[PDB]
Each structure stands twice: as C-alpha cells, then as structure tokens.
Design a protein that fits this description.
The chain has 279 residues and is of the alpha/beta class. The protein has a single domain, classed as Rossmann fold. The chain is built from 6 helices and 15 strands. The strands form 5 sheets. It has a 7-stranded parallel β-sheet, with helices on both faces. A two-stranded antiparallel ribbon has the order 1-2. It has a two-stranded antiparallel sheet with strand order 7-9. β12 and β13 form a beta hairpin. α2 runs parallel beside α5 and α3 runs parallel beside α4. The longest helix is centred in the C-terminal third of the chain and has 17 residues. The N and C termini lie close together (7 Å). 58% of the residues are buried. The PDB classes it as hydrolase. The entry lists the keywords FragMAX, FragMAXapp, fragment screening, hydrolase, inhibition. The assembly is monomeric. PanDDA analysis group deposition -- Proteinase K crystal structure Apo20.
Length: 279
C-alpha cells in the first residue's frame, strides 16, 4: 500500500533515503495487534482513530486526554492518516495528568496494569506498549518496564529530551526495553535527543504531525514522537509474523537503516527504524 503526501516520518520509516513523502507498507497494517499508549490519555472519539482506540484505565478524575500529548502519540502509532500501524487496536492508560505530569508510583502501577490487562484483550498478533515519558533514574521504574517486557509486551520508551546520556533517566536506561532516540527530516540527530549506549534505535522525532485533542492535528517534536513510530513499527512487524514481542527491538535494530544519521555521538548506535517493505 502507498499513502501519498504522508507525514515525513512515515515516509522515512519505509525509505532507504530521506526526502520522500509517500509511506509504503503492507496492507495488513498491524491488524490483530494491540498497542497500549501509557500517557495523558487518548481522545478516542477522534475520527482519525476510526473506533479502534479506547481508554482502559485512568488514575485521575477522568480518562479523557486534557493535554493532547497522549492523543498525538497514539496518532503516530495507529491513526488512519498519521499512524504507522493503521489497523492496530489502541488502548489508553492515563498515568499522566492533564499537565503531562505523573508520580513514578502511578507510572509503575500503569505498567503492571498493562502486563495483566493484555490477558483481557484480543491481540493474536501480539502486544506493544509505548511509553513517551520519563524522569531521573529509578531502579523501581526500570524494574517495572522490565517486568512489562518480560510478560510478553514489546516495550518502547523515549530516550528523553535533555541532549544528555540516557543512562541517567528512567525507563530509558532499562536495558531490556527498546529505548528510542529522535531524528529530523534531514537525518540529523534531533537537537534535544538523548544519546548513549542504552539507546537501541532512532525514529522520526522533529516536527511530527499527528492527532490532537478537540478533533484537531498539530506538529510537535520530542523523543515522545519517535517512540510511537517504533511502537507502531513493532506492531506492524508482529502482525506480519516477522518477529515477536521479545525479539522485536533486536529485529528492528537488525533491519534498520545503518550509518545514515549525523551528529550521533561516538558510542551511540547509528540506526534508524525501517520497515523494509518491498512494494
């Protein structure tokens, strides 16, 4: 399948070159997979989600996304126009308040929630979790991410936006999950992207158009935007049967575009997520 005039990040993930604008992908499109977006919520009524999104858990007075961040990330995973895996099922877990903030205890509870809740959902092609959040190093936060991964969920987490080594941030620093840095449309490391040996992969993160609350759209930047590209890619590849939740991060690194990004610090992987789809 070909989506013309796609957001640059979608085109990038199906291309061996920057500078194109059509997204190419197998029509299976993540059907039969599920992606949990652990964030500020998801505006599930947005036409872009086509009834495939739902809130399953909140720790606050509402499950609605009063911020936009979670809706944007969910849109990059799976919206019809802005999403990588256009037929996946999206499940929202609201661990962040409408200011985008959350206690680590709440975030940990949300991760353990997903590890159990997947057993209440129909995801025959596999389960992914996208975590566009983080703060300073916490062994307990890392352990929760490790448990979620161990339970059979492909966990993708943001590297962070400090232009610093991600070893000092959580869950970015957890070795067993997939830690995602950000790049721009010219294949440069995004100016804010964290780096370091703990990163597994880069995805598009600068000037990313996606869904927003109020039935709208907007372009924003962050490792929060790169992470759902990788989460959606994992769901798409799992639906194709090419990999599993336990092996998808490694498979994405195996099949990435290699050596094509600029301003990658010595010791950080130079790997850009790529779907290897041959039309």
């Amino acid at each position: 399948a070909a989506q013309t005039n796609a957001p640059w990040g979608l085109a990038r993930i199906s291309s061996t070159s920057p500078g194109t604008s059509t997204y190419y992908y197998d029509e299976s499109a993540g059907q039969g997979s599920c992606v949990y977006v652990i964030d500020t919520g998801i505006e599930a009524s947005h036409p872009e989600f086509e009834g495939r999104a739902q809130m399953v858990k909140t720790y606050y007075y509402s499950s609605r996304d009063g911020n936009g961040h979670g809706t944007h990330c969910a849109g990059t995973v799976g919206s019809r126009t802005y999403g990588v895996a256009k037929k996946t099922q999206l499940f929202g877990v609201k661990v962040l308040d409408d200011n985008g903030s959350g206690q680590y205890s709440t975030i940990i509870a949300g991760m353990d929630f997903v590890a159990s809740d997947k057993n209440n959902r129909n995801c025959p092609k596999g389960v992914v979790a996208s975590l566009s959040l983080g703060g300073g190093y916490s062994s307990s936060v890392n352990s929760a991410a490790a448990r979620l991964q161990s339970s059979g969920v492909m966990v993708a987490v943001a590297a962070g936006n400090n232009n610093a080594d991600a070893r000092n941030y959580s869950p970015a620093s957890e070795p067993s999950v997939c830690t995602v840095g950000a790049s721009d449309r010219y294949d440069r490391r995004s100016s804010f992207s964290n780096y370091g040996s703990v990163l597994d992969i880069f995805g598009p993160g600068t000037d990313i158009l996606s869904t927003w609350i109020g039935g709208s759209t907007r372009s924003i930047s962050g490792t929060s935007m790169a992470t759902p590209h990788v989460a959606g890619l994992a769901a798409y590849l799992m639906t194709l049967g090419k990999t599993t939740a336990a092996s998808a991060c490694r498979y994405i690194a195996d099949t990435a575009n290699k050596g094509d990004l600029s301003n990658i610090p010595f010791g950080t992987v130079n790997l850009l997520a790529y779907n290897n789809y041959q039309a």
